[PDB]
Design an enzyme around this catalytic site. Structure first.
Site, PDB file in Angstrom:
ATOM      1  CG  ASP A 140       5.648   2.801  -5.337  1.00 20.76           C
ATOM      2  OD1 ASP A 140       6.827   2.690  -4.871  1.00 20.76           O
ATOM      3  OD2 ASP A 140       4.920   1.817  -5.619  1.00 20.76           O
ATOM      4  CG  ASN A 198       0.938   2.811  -6.248  1.00 21.16           C
ATOM      5  OD1 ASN A 198       0.477   2.199  -5.282  1.00 21.16           O
ATOM      6  ND2 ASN A 198       1.984   2.381  -6.935  1.00 21.16           N
ATOM      7  CE  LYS A 219       0.254  -0.845  -4.662  1.00 16.11           C
ATOM      8  NZ  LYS A 219       0.136  -0.601  -6.130  1.00 16.11           N
TER       9      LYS A 219
END
Ligand code: A5P
Ligand code: A5P
Lengths: 281, 264, 270, 280
Positions: free
Chosen positions: A249, A25, A59
């Site tokens: 996640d 991720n 992110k």
């Protein structure tokens, strides 16, 4: 049915053997990225699956300001450089601001448009202008027949190497469903762009009062089998050696020791369905 | 839990898939015999276990004069001749409690309509009739909530219950199939066979192959399917049956011999 | 017009003062029913709101066969007869099987089609044929423009006295949303049937207490009636209900909003 | 909490509602002045506090071929002329971090677009610019998660945040408004002012369309319902001839209907703001 050239020997197309866009991720460290990629490289080479390594350098859209964001652009591009030099495989990463497109394209072999941002004209145009294949995550809010407009934005500035990535649709509050009918709608309204299935983010759900996403990793095989059986250009996957400790996640991440197990079933199903025709009309 | 339907036909989530296949509504003896004949030939050739499906009444159509089928008395006579001629088990839906016992004398599986799945007295009269029961999951019901209807059947002595996906409401006048729901239905009900009704799932906004492939790949007990030789005049065109079913069998045989990843 | 007359002094209409279809979940005893109906009558009289008393004689869709279902049809009609005699109030109850429609019609003033059962032809026809006004609960799964087919079924057998009752739409798993745009769709696609808002069953939603917000929003749209259930101590109730002591508080807000919007015009927005 | 916007304009959930009203997109100075002028006349006549809205850019049109507006530089000049000419505060939306500061020099409230409300550096940039912030609630976000957007603004010193309902994804190509959302937004964020965007809430679309559909014929249905809940403000776009609007015409109020809509809003609002919660 259009085929998108990514790097030597790696081409994505709805009639072709599936391409794995696989990794993690979020970039955390050099050694962790190299180790996890090393495992994907070993398994994909063993099974003869074409492979593109995935990670996010940032992110930019965490729900909470306190949640982990990653190493960032400057350090992330250096880790990708070392992945490429070490392993010889192409890499895929997402782009959050227009001004990031060109620098990122010096290193990344595919640029990804984040799901919430797929309607933002100046970002899409900047990504498209950077000259690499583009992976468009279908927004949770977007019908599969509307992706054509995103592709036309890319095409307007001369980039016709566009892939379309399913990652679930909003289903009431705080849940996603995957409409398996959407793959064909995406392909057939865009002149046959390659369609990819993000089985990881499609497993997202959440607590109404939570600080970070929930997720449904115990069901990844169910969803991955169903999607690959449709007949699609690629599978998009994140893993972690211990998902409960991932920084983003984790609830949807494949336990890394189950990678060979999952991919052997994907290959067996892809090899089978890729030989089967449409019904007689 | 495997559910024995008749000799040579058992539905179960780890077993080869059973086709529950036929037509929407019963219209005449001769046409029903002809279509069932085509289903029997193809399934026999391919080696797929088969249960013939048809309704004797359409109890929920949009106008009082709209065509409903031959009805109970005549329908049961047709089913009797389908069974005697082909040696095939049959499945039909029951709309009123008092139809349960009569239907049960002839039908080998009794089906609960999706809209009616929560009606206590209908479900109990169906369960008590003593044949395996197929419960259509309501458009409005979450896949972890079927357990109540299964428990109702168990409370009157019937532990041979199967659960059928037919889509979930997705905004107005549209259905989506959540492929994560199959496991949920099976795990929360002690492992009931899960079946996928591909035909009524497509009551939505050509697309049948895609959806049938996706569902069968999950690993399920059966496929529920309606056909007609000319659907215009969501039924599968009948000439496509063999082409569809050979894809279904190859995918089903593959996934049924690959293991679970127990992902934690 | 498309207004539905229920009993003397009580008519439901989208441009009329709102009618309260108010009562309880299930009939349990004579005396409890008379006591609660008594309170509804006293509050609605004081405030000047036309009133129809609601109760079910059977809960046909509970999750266990051993779960309490209410007094049943025979005892239920007996209770409704004493309610009518004691208070001179019209009554509404729901009908679950075709054969119940006629005997229920001997006593009840409005028959209700349960939400899950609104597409079932023989049930609806039997209810329509009994000759009283019909209240159709819009199913969770049905769009507001598709109710017209249920209303046509009723007309095909001679009943042109049909009302339509919002109770929420499916919104992902185990949750309902009320689409406030659907009131007008229901009315306009059916030749102007009275539309009613069931605030109690619309609140079978997630709540990570909200009856007031929702009732205010719905009544402000401009509609024919409010459907409500109440109980003195809802948590100790047999089978969502408003605490009875709040009835007057709720209804005074409903009346003030309704009176205001019913005297302001629709805008014709092209 | 009450958010002070300008002299004589404060937004709060127990206060008389504020109209955030205007046009979808800036096309020219004279049209903007003319429409703003009609809003100022009508609100002054009725006695409704007023903030003028317009976008300088539509950065998210579905089609590359669709109209975007005059853009930042010309848009900011129009807003400066609007302010000088009428003395009205203004609200506009911001699409990139670097736009926040120049916008704040002119605009009196800065808006976060629905699709971008999760984008940390954008929300932080907007917040840091020092003006009250209006957050459009994403179509994909539940009402109890807005708290996290408020905390981002708070983390950088801005506690003047308002929360704007604009509908939730309901299947494909449609929006529904959950009226239970307003309270959930207010009660999980320490009582932020809640605003209702009646215009965008009406959006729907054709699966194969090139631009949004909409349901303006129902704007009164929706606006009545929402104002009746008891909220801090109403967000509204209008056009003299909506069929010719260059963005979101399908949902725009016909401008000649403004006074008629607003008189109803004031009547319902004045009534409900005098009524209590039910007794516990
Ligand atoms: O912060 P939470 O709520 O976990 O959200 C996670 C997202 O940031 C993440 O899924 C991201 O969208 C990957 O693109
Ligand atoms: O370009 P279309 O598809 O009409 O979408 C319109 C949006 O850009 C618009 O609603 C914007 O979000 C604010 O007005």
């Amino acid at each position: 049915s259009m085929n998108v050239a990514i790097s030597p020997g790696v081409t994505a197309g709805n009639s072709l053997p599936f391409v794995l866009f696989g990794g993690i991720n979020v970039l955390e460290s050099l050694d962790f990225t190299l180790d996890v990629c090393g495992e994907y490289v070993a398994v994909t080479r063993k099974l003869g699956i074409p492979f593109v390594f995935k990670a996010s350098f940032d992110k930019a859209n965490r729900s909470s300001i306190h949640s982990y964001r990653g190493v960032g652009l400057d350090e992330g591009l250096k880790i990708f450089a070392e992945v490429k030099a070490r392993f010889g495989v192409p890499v895929i990463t997402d782009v959050h601001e227009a001004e990031q497109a060109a620098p990122v394209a010096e290193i990344a072999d595919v640029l990804q448009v984040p799901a919430f941002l797929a309607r933002q004209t100046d970002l899409v145009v900047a990504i498209a202008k950077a000259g690499k294949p583009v992976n468009v995550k279908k927004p949770q809010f977007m019908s599969p027949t509307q992706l054509k407009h995103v592709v036309s934005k890319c095409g307007e500035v001369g980039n016709d190497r566009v892939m379309l990535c399913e990652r679930g649709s909003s289903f009431g509050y705080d849940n996603l469903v995957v409409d398996m009918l959407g793959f064909r709608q995406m392909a057939e309204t865009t002149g046959g762009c390659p369609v990819i299935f993000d089985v990881t983010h499609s497993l997202q759900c959440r607590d109404p009062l939570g600080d970070a996403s929930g997720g449904r990793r115990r069901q990844v095989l169910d969803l991955a089998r169903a999607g690959i059986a449709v007949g699609i250009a690629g599978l998009f996957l994140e893993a972690h050696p211990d998902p409960d400790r991932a920084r983003c996640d984790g609830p949807s991440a494949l336990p890394l020791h189950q990678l060979e197990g999952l991919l052997s079933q994907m290959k067996a199903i892809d090899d089978l369905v890729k030989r089967m025709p449409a019904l007689e009309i």
